[PDB]
């Protein structure tokens, strides 16, 4: 019974995050969006945050220890367990992390400040999220299709 | 619209962009929405200039909230492309934020410029 209650709670949470901010939900998903709303406190308090802050939401301990010890700061926070950065690996994962943080900041500002005439579909409300998602996936597939270094093909002799 | 402290006078826009170019040469400037946000939150920003030709205005409408909370003047110039090649970027910047220091002719210019922004208000 507890597990079935958890499952229907997650369905409710997805419905509610879709109702609140469709741009962030079309970008990453209601779960990680809910995590970001939790760590910020409020939707307006999150919309007041810049892109780098949304990148390193959740990694605050490692961030401030590395900054106070002159170490290298952590690359990402909850954006890792977001979906779209999961397709990459290593440096492309870091670059997708920056780009997804910036577009998430854009989409959360749009979802928390744009006004609509209320006879507006969820599609024309989440147009910014859909466009950002498509463009970001194109950038990801490009970084994945970056070619390796060409090398001199040596024959049997060494020529 | 929501761009109520708008700067429409072309002499005022020319003065603002000349001041932005000068501060950019002095590296007393922060370019872009996210660096504007960070500078205003840390409270160092002496004046902040937004661009009205952003196609979703909501991607910059958050800055006046913290600006009212921190009592720093903000003003809307028309063209993001004008603001861009005034900063010296060749990309369309939408929110620039120019700070203050201990002593400079640019500090005196910033005082006069925020006086003119208060006139605009």
């Amino acid at each position: 019974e507890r597990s079935e209650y958890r499952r229907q709670l997650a369905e409710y949470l997805q419905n509610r995050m879709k109702a609140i901010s469709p741009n962030m939900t079309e970008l990453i998903g209601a779960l990680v969006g809910a995590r970001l709303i939790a760590h910020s406190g409020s939707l307006v308090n999150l919309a007041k945050n810049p892109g780098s802050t949304i990148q390193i939401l959740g990694a605050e301990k490692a961030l401030f220890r590395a900054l106070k010890t002159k170490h290298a700061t952590p690359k990402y926070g909850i954006i890792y367990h977001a979906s779209l950065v999961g397709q990459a690996s290593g440096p492309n994962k870091g670059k997708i992390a920056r780009q997804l943080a910036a577009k998430i900041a854009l989409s959360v500002r749009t979802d928390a400040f744009e006004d609509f005439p209320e006879n507006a579909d969820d599609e024309t409300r989440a147009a910014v999220g859909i466009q950002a998602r498509a463009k970001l996936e194109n950038n990801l597939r490009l970084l994945e299709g970056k070619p390796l270094n060409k090398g001199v093909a040596l024959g049997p002799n060494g020529i | 619209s929501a761009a109520w402290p708008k700067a429409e006078d072309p002499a005022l826009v020319q003065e603002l962009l000349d001041c932005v170019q000068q501060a950019s040469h002095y590296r007393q400037l922060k370019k872009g929405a996210n660096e504007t946000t960070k500078s205003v939150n840390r409270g160092t920003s002496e004046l902040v200039i937004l661009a009205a030709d952003t196609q979703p205005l909501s991607i910059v409408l958050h800055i006046p909230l913290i600006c009212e909370e921190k009592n720093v003047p903000y003003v809307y110039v028309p063209s993001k492309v004008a603001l861009g090649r005034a900063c010296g970027v060749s990309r369309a910047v939408i929110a620039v934020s120019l700070t203050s220091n201990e002593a400079s002719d640019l500090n005196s210019k910033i005082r006069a410029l925020r006086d003119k922004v208060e006139r605009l208000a």
Binding site: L67, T73 | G43
Partner: peptide, 30 residues
């Protein structure tokens, strides 16, 4: 730069708190 920025943020919060407490301790009215 990052380390100096963090120390400046801390010092700014402390200066705000101290100026507030100092004012709270200690032709104006007509």
């Amino acid at each position: 730069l990052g380390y100096v920025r963090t120390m400046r943020n801390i010092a700014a919060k402390e200066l705000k708190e101290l100026e507030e407490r100092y004012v709270l301790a200690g032709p104006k009215k007509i």
